[PDB]
RNA sequence: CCAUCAUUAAGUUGGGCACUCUAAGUUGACUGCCGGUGACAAACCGGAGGAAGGUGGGGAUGACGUCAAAUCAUCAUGCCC
C-alpha cells in the first residue's frame, strides 16, 4: 500500500507516499528532528493527519526538493494532504475546512526596475 | 483598504509547547530582523526561569502577568484645535491583547543584564508581582488620561 | 502623454517579424549585414511605393521580400532593374540568392505608404489640413476602419510647433487584438524637418 | 535658508550674493517661525527676448514659486519678493484659523395623504395594482360611499364600506 | 432589432462569451421595452393618439413641429391649444380609457374595407 | 368572477393612540376613524415594515 | 526525474522504471451558480461548489492634456558660426 502524493508551497515541490504502519517521517532518507531545523513547526507539520486522527497509522518517508525549511515544510503537511484524500476519501471537508488542503498561495514578489527591492520605493529627500 | 471599510484581520497558529496562542505572539514581537528560531529559543528559554522562581508553570504566569501590563484607558488625540486635544477613550479588546505585548518587550530590552535568557524573565516575574518597569509605565498612562477626565 | 508606437506592444503577439533568421554564434556581425541592406536598400529605390521588407537567411541562400506598393518598378522591364539590383546586392554581401518580391493591393492602406505620400505633399508646400483630410476621406473610402493622422513641427510655416491631429473609426490602441500599423516620415521643409505620424486599422 | 544659486548661460556675480539674502531671505526669516528650508534661484537668459527668475522655496505643507520675465536682474527681484511676501500670509491665513469658538457638549407614523376620488371597484384595483398598495380608498361610483378595497391576508381582496 | 434577433438564430453564438451573450440579450430586451410597438414601423406616421398631453407632452411637441395631425384624450389639467382634434374624457380610470379608446381603435379597421 | 366580502363600519372620533388601542383589539392592520383635533378621515395601518402609518384622506 | 531489481564508489549506472517530479504544447473563474429581506435597481452581505472568489497576485499597456519640462553630446536638421 502506498498511498502517493504531491505538494506545493513557495517554489518548493515535496512528493509524499503512505506506507503502512505508525507515524514516521524519513525526509531526504534521515530523521526529521536532525533536517528540520528546530522542532517547533512540526506540530503544526502534523496538522493535517490530525483531523483523521491517523497518528499511529501511516509512514510517509518524503522526497523533498527545493526551497527552505519553512518551504519543505508546510508543503509536506501539503504533501500528505493530497495524500491523505486518497487514503480517507470521505474525510475532505475536515481538511478543506480546517487548513491543509488549500493551495500553495503566494511566493515572493517581483521586483519592479526604477525601485530598490519589491515594491519598496527608495527614499527621496525634498517632499 | 483602510477607507474602504476595516482590513479582514488574519489567524495567527498557537504554540507547540503551551498550546498558547499569545505565546507565539510573543514570538513574532520578540522576533527582531525576521529571525524565527534565534528569538523562540530565547523565550523557550526566558520561561524555564519563570519556573524556576515560581513553581507554577508559566502559562499562567504568562497571563497573569500581562493583566498588570494591559491598561484600560489610553488617549487618542481628537484635533479640537485650542482644546485639549486629548481624549480619554477606552481600549478595543484587540489593542488591549497587543499593547500589553508591546510594553513587555520594549522594556526588556533596557536592563542591567544582557542576555534576554533573563532580560525577559525578571519583567515578566516583575509583571507578575505587579511591579517592575513595565507596570509602572501603565500606572503612567493611569496618571495621564485619568488627570485629564474632562473628555469622557 | 508618451504614447509608445503601437507596433512594439505586438511584434509577436498579434504580429510577426521583419526578420525571420536565426544565428546562435556570430549574432552581431550578420545582424549588421540586415541593416546595410536596409539602408541600401531605402537609397536607390527612393520611395519606389516600398511599405517594408523582410530579410530571411537560410544556408548562404540569404532572401529579401519587398512589398512595392507600385510593383514592377523594382522589376523593370521584364525581370530588367530587379536583376539590375542583385548585381550590387550580391556585392555587398556575399550571396543573396532568390532575391524577390511580392505585391500589395490598397496602395495606400498600408501605413507606410500613407506617411510618406502626404509627406512628399510638404515639400510644394500646399495646404496641410487637406494634406491630412485627403488621407483621412480616402481611407475608409478604400476599405479601412479606423484613420489616425497627424503633423508635429514648424506647423504651417510659422516658429511655435503644434501637433495637429484628424481622427475618425476605431482606434484601439490599447487593444492587443487589434492590427495597428504606423509610420513616421521626415518631411523637410527647408525650415526645419515636419514630423508626421499615421494609424490605419484594417 | 539656504541659496542653491545657478545661472543658465549667465555668470553669477557676487553683488546679486548679497541682494538676494537681503531680500528674499531676511523678509521671509520672519515668517515661518520654526524654520529650516532650502531655496532655489534660476537665472535663465535668452538672447532673443529677456532674461527670467524662478525662485522656489519648499516647505512643509505648501510651496512658494514665483516668475518674472523681466531682464533687469535687481528691479525683478523687488517683484519676486513681492510675489513671495503675498503667498506666504495666503499660507499662514489658512492654517490660523485655528481661532474658531467650537464648545463641547417615540413612535413616528409616516403619513401619506391622498384626495379621495370618485371610480368603479374594478378601477380602484386597477390603480392599486399599479402602486402595490394593499389599501386603496375611493368614492363608489355608483353607491356615492366611501370604500376601501383592501388585499387580505387571505390573498383575495376584501371591501370595507365607511 | 431586426438583427440582433437574427444574429442568435443562426449560429454566431456559440464562440461568444458567456458574459457577452449577457449584455448581446441585456441589449436585446431594452430595445423591445421602449422600441417594441416600433417593431414593425420604417416610416413617419400621419396620426398620433395621445392618452395625456401632460405627462406626454415631449410627444406633442414633436407633433407640432412635424405638421402631423393630433387626436387626445384630455381633461383638467389638459390643454387643448396644441390637440386639433379634441376628445374630452377622464384620464385616471382604466374603463374611461379602455372604453373609449377601444372605439378610435376600432374607427380605422372599417376605414380600411 | 371574484367576490370581494365587505365588512361595514361606522366612522367614529378618537385620538390616534385610541385607533391603535382599537385595532389591537381586533388584530386588523387598518383602522380608519376621523381624528379627534384635526377633524379628518385618518386611516391608521401596519405596513409591511411591521411599523404604523398614517393616512389622511 | 529512480517507489519496485541491485554490483550505490552514489556511474543515479543495467533495464528503462515514465509512475510521481520537472521541463513544454492546452482545459478552466464570472458575481456562472444560491440564500438574504433587499426590493427587484444594480450592487453589496453570508454561504458553497473547484486548487483558486469577487478587476485572484503581479507585469505590460499611461485618454484629452499641463510644465516654451529634459536632450541641437545617441541620432537627425532650420539658422548662425
Redesign the pocket.
Given at each position: 500500500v502506498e498511498y502517493?502524493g504531491?505538494g506545493?508551497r513557495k517554489n518548493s515541490?515535496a512528493?509524499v507516499?503512505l506506507?503502512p504502519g505508525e507515524g514516521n517521517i524519513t525526509v531526504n532518507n534521515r530523521d526529521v528532528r536532525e533536517y528540520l531545523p528546530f522542532e517547533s513547526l512540526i506540530l503544526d507539520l502534523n496538522q493535517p493527519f490530525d483531523v483523521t486522527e491517523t497518528k499511529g497509522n501511516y509512514d510517509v518517508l518524503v522526497?523533498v526538493?527545493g526551497g527552505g525549511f519553512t518551504g519543505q515544510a508546510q508543503a509536506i503537511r501539503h504533501g500528505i494532504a493530497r495524500a491523505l484524500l486518497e487514503a480517507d476519501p470521505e474525510y475532505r471537508?475536515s481538511l478543506?475546512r480546517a487548513g491543509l488542503?488549500?493551495?500553495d498561495?503566494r511566493m515572493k514578489?517581483?521586483k519592479?526596475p526604477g525601485l530598490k527591492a519589491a515594491r519598496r520605493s527608495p527614499q527621496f529627500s525634498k517632499r | 483598504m483602510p477607507r474602504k471599510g476595516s482590513v479582514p484581520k488574519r489567524d495567527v497558529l498557537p504554540d507547540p509547547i503551551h498550546n498558547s496562542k499569545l505565546v507565539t505572539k510573543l514570538i513574532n514581537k520578540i522576533m527582531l530582523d525576521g529571525k524565527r528560531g534565534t528569538a523562540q529559543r530565547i523565550l523557550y528559554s526566558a520561561f524555564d526561569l519563570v519556573e524556576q522562581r515560581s513553581g507554577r508553570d508559566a502559562l499562567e504566569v504568562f497571563e497573569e502577568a500581562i493583566n498588570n501590563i494591559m491598561p484600560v484607558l489610553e488617549v487618542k488625540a481628537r484635533r479640537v484645535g485650542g482644546s485639549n486635544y486629548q481624549v480619554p477613550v477606552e481600549v478595543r479588546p484587540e489593542r488591549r491583547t497587543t499593547l500589553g505585548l508591546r510594553w513587555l518587550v520594549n522594556y526588556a530590552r533596557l536592563r542591567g543584564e544582557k542576555t534576554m535568557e533573563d532580560r525577559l524573565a525578571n519583567e515578566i516575574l516583575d509583571a507578575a508581582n505587579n511591579t517592575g518597569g513595565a507596570v509602572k509605565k501603565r500606572e503612567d498612562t493611569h496618571k495621564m488620561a485619568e488627570a485629564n477626565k474632562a473628555f469622557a | 502623454?508618451?504614447?509608445?508606437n503601437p507596433i512594439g506592444?505586438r511584434v509577436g503577439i498579434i504580429r510577426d517579424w521583419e526578420a525571420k533568421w536565426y544565428a546562435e554564434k556570430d549574432f552581431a556581425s550578420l545582424l549588421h549585414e540586415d541593416l546595410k541592406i536596409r539602408k541600401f536598400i531605402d537609397n536607390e529605390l527612393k520611395e519606389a511605393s516600398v511599405s517594408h521588407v523582410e530579410i530571411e537567411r537560410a544556408a548562404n541562400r540569404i532572401n529579401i521580400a519587398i512589398h512595392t506598393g507600385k510593383p514592377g518598378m523594382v522589376i523593370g522591364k521584364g525581370g530588367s532593374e530587379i536583376e539590375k539590383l542583385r548585381n550590387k546586392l550580391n556585392a555587398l554581401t556575399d550571396k543573396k540568392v532568390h532575391i524577390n518580391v511580392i505585391e500589395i493591393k490598397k496602395v495606400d492602406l498600408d501605413a507606410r505608404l500613407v506617411a510618406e505620400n502626404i509627406a512628399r505633399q510638404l515639400e510644394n508646400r500646399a495646404s496641410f489640413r487637406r494634406v491630412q483630410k485627403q488621407a483621412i476621406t480616402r481611407a475608409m473610402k478604400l476599405g479601412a476602419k479606423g484613420i489616425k493622422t497627424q503633423v508635429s513641427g514648424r506647423l504651417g510655416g510659422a516658429?511655435?510647433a503644434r501637433a495637429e491631429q484628424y481622427s475618425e473609426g476605431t482606434v484601439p490602441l490599447?487593444t492587443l487584438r487589434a492590427d495597428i500599423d504606423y509610420a513616421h516620415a521626415?518631411a523637410?521643409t527647408?525650415?526645419?524637418?515636419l514630423g508626421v505620424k499615421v494609424w490605419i486599422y484594417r | 535658508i539656504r541659496f542653491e544659486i545657478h545661472g543658465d548661460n549667465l555668470t553669477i556675480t557676487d553683488a546679486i550674493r548679497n541682494y538676494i539674502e537681503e531680500k528674499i531671505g531676511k523678509l521671509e526669516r520672519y515668517f515661518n517661525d520654526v524654520p529650516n528650508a532650502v531655496a532655489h534661484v534660476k537665472v535663465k537668459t535668452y538672447s532673443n527676448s529677456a532674461t527670467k527668475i524662478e525662485v522656489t522655496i519648499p516647505l512643509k505643507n505648501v510651496t512658494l514659486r514665483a516668475e518674472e520675465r523681466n531682464d533687469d536682474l535687481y528691479a525683478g527681484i523687488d517683484l519676486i519678493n513681492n510675489k513671495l511676501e503675498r503667498q506666504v500670509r495666503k499660507y499662514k491665513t489658512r492654517i490660523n484659523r485655528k481661532s474658531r469658538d467650537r464648545g463641547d457638549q417615540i413612535e413616528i407614523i409616516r403619513s401619506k395623504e391622498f384626495s379621495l376620488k370618485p371610480m368603479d371597484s374594478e378601477e380602484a384595483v386597477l390603480q392599486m395594482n399599479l402602486l402595490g398598495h394593499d389599501f386603496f380608498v375611493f368614492t363608489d361610483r355608483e353607491t356615492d360611499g366611501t370604500s376601501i378595497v383592501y388585499r387580505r391576508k387571505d390573498g383575495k381582496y376584501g371591501l370595507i364600506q365607511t | 432589432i431586426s438583427e440582433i434577433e437574427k444574429m442568435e438564430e443562426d449560429g454566431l453564438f456559440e464562440v461568444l462569451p458567456?458574459?457577452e451573450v449577457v449584455e448581446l440579450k441585456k441589449e436585446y430586451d431594452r430595445l423591445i421595452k421602449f422600441l417594441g410597438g416600433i417593431r414593425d414601423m420604417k416610416s413617419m406616421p400621419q396620426a398620433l393618439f395621445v392618452v395625456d398631453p401632460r405627462k406626454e407632452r415631449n410627444a406633442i411637441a414633436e407633433a407640432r413641429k412635424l405638421n402631423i395631425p393630433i387626436v387626445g384624450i384630455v381633461d383638467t389639467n389638459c390643454d387643448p391649444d396644441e390637440i386639433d382634434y379634441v376628445i374630452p374624457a377622464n384620464d385616471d380610470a382604466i374603463r374611461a380609457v379602455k372604453l373609449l379608446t377601444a372605439k378610435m381603435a376600432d374607427a380605422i379597421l372599417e376605414g380600411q374595407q
Amino acid at each position: 500500500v502506498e498511498y502517493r502524493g504531491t505538494g506545493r508551497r513557495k517554489n518548493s515541490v515535496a512528493r509524499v507516499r503512505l506506507v503502512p504502519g505508525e507515524g514516521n517521517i524519513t525526509v531526504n532518507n534521515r530523521d526529521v528532528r536532525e533536517y528540520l531545523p528546530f522542532e517547533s513547526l512540526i506540530l503544526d507539520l502534523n496538522q493535517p493527519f490530525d483531523v483523521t486522527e491517523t497518528k499511529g497509522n501511516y509512514d510517509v518517508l518524503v522526497n523533498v526538493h527545493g526551497g527552505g525549511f519553512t518551504g519543505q515544510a508546510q508543503a509536506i503537511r501539503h504533501g500528505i494532504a493530497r495524500a491523505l484524500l486518497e487514503a480517507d476519501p470521505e474525510y475532505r471537508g475536515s481538511l478543506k475546512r480546517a487548513g491543509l488542503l488549500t493551495r500553495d498561495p503566494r511566493m515572493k514578489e517581483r521586483k519592479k526596475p526604477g525601485l530598490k527591492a519589491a515594491r519598496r520605493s527608495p527614499q527621496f529627500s525634498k517632499r | 483598504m483602510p477607507r474602504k471599510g476595516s482590513v479582514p484581520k488574519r489567524d495567527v497558529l498557537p504554540d507547540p509547547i503551551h498550546n498558547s496562542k499569545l505565546v507565539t505572539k510573543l514570538i513574532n514581537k520578540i522576533m527582531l530582523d525576521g529571525k524565527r528560531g534565534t528569538a523562540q529559543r530565547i523565550l523557550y528559554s526566558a520561561f524555564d526561569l519563570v519556573e524556576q522562581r515560581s513553581g507554577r508553570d508559566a502559562l499562567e504566569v504568562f497571563e497573569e502577568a500581562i493583566n498588570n501590563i494591559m491598561p484600560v484607558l489610553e488617549v487618542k488625540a481628537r484635533r479640537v484645535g485650542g482644546s485639549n486635544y486629548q481624549v480619554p477613550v477606552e481600549v478595543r479588546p484587540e489593542r488591549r491583547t497587543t499593547l500589553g505585548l508591546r510594553w513587555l518587550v520594549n522594556y526588556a530590552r533596557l536592563r542591567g543584564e544582557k542576555t534576554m535568557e533573563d532580560r525577559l524573565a525578571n519583567e515578566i516575574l516583575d509583571a507578575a508581582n505587579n511591579t517592575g518597569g513595565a507596570v509602572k509605565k501603565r500606572e503612567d498612562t493611569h496618571k495621564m488620561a485619568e488627570a485629564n477626565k474632562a473628555f469622557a | 502623454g508618451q504614447k509608445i508606437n503601437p507596433i512594439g506592444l505586438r511584434v509577436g503577439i498579434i504580429r510577426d517579424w521583419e526578420a525571420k533568421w536565426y544565428a546562435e554564434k556570430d549574432f552581431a556581425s550578420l545582424l549588421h549585414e540586415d541593416l546595410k541592406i536596409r539602408k541600401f536598400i531605402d537609397n536607390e529605390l527612393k520611395e519606389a511605393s516600398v511599405s517594408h521588407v523582410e530579410i530571411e537567411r537560410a544556408a548562404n541562400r540569404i532572401n529579401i521580400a519587398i512589398h512595392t506598393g507600385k510593383p514592377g518598378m523594382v522589376i523593370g522591364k521584364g525581370g530588367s532593374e530587379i536583376e539590375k539590383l542583385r548585381n550590387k546586392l550580391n556585392a555587398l554581401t556575399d550571396k543573396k540568392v532568390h532575391i524577390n518580391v511580392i505585391e500589395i493591393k490598397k496602395v495606400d492602406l498600408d501605413a507606410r505608404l500613407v506617411a510618406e505620400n502626404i509627406a512628399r505633399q510638404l515639400e510644394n508646400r500646399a495646404s496641410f489640413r487637406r494634406v491630412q483630410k485627403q488621407a483621412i476621406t480616402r481611407a475608409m473610402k478604400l476599405g479601412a476602419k479606423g484613420i489616425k493622422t497627424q503633423v508635429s513641427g514648424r506647423l504651417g510655416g510659422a516658429d511655435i510647433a503644434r501637433a495637429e491631429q484628424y481622427s475618425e473609426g476605431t482606434v484601439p490602441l490599447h487593444t492587443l487584438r487589434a492590427d495597428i500599423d504606423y509610420a513616421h516620415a521626415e518631411a523637410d521643409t527647408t525650415y526645419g524637418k515636419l514630423g508626421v505620424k499615421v494609424w490605419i486599422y484594417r | 535658508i539656504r541659496f542653491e544659486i545657478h545661472g543658465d548661460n549667465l555668470t553669477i556675480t557676487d553683488a546679486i550674493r548679497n541682494y538676494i539674502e537681503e531680500k528674499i531671505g531676511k523678509l521671509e526669516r520672519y515668517f515661518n517661525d520654526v524654520p529650516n528650508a532650502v531655496a532655489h534661484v534660476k537665472v535663465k537668459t535668452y538672447s532673443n527676448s529677456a532674461t527670467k527668475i524662478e525662485v522656489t522655496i519648499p516647505l512643509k505643507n505648501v510651496t512658494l514659486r514665483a516668475e518674472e520675465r523681466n531682464d533687469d536682474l535687481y528691479a525683478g527681484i523687488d517683484l519676486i519678493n513681492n510675489k513671495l511676501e503675498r503667498q506666504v500670509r495666503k499660507y499662514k491665513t489658512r492654517i490660523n484659523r485655528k481661532s474658531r469658538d467650537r464648545g463641547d457638549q417615540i413612535e413616528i407614523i409616516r403619513s401619506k395623504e391622498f384626495s379621495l376620488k370618485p371610480m368603479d371597484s374594478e378601477e380602484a384595483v386597477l390603480q392599486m395594482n399599479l402602486l402595490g398598495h394593499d389599501f386603496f380608498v375611493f368614492t363608489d361610483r355608483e353607491t356615492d360611499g366611501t370604500s376601501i378595497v383592501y388585499r387580505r391576508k387571505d390573498g383575495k381582496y376584501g371591501l370595507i364600506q365607511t | 432589432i431586426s438583427e440582433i434577433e437574427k444574429m442568435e438564430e443562426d449560429g454566431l453564438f456559440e464562440v461568444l462569451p458567456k458574459k457577452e451573450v449577457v449584455e448581446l440579450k441585456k441589449e436585446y430586451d431594452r430595445l423591445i421595452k421602449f422600441l417594441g410597438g416600433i417593431r414593425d414601423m420604417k416610416s413617419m406616421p400621419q396620426a398620433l393618439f395621445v392618452v395625456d398631453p401632460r405627462k406626454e407632452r415631449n410627444a406633442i411637441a414633436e407633433a407640432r413641429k412635424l405638421n402631423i395631425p393630433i387626436v387626445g384624450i384630455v381633461d383638467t389639467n389638459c390643454d387643448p391649444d396644441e390637440i386639433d382634434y379634441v376628445i374630452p374624457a377622464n384620464d385616471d380610470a382604466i374603463r374611461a380609457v379602455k372604453l373609449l379608446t377601444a372605439k378610435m381603435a376600432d374607427a380605422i379597421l372599417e376605414g380600411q374595407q
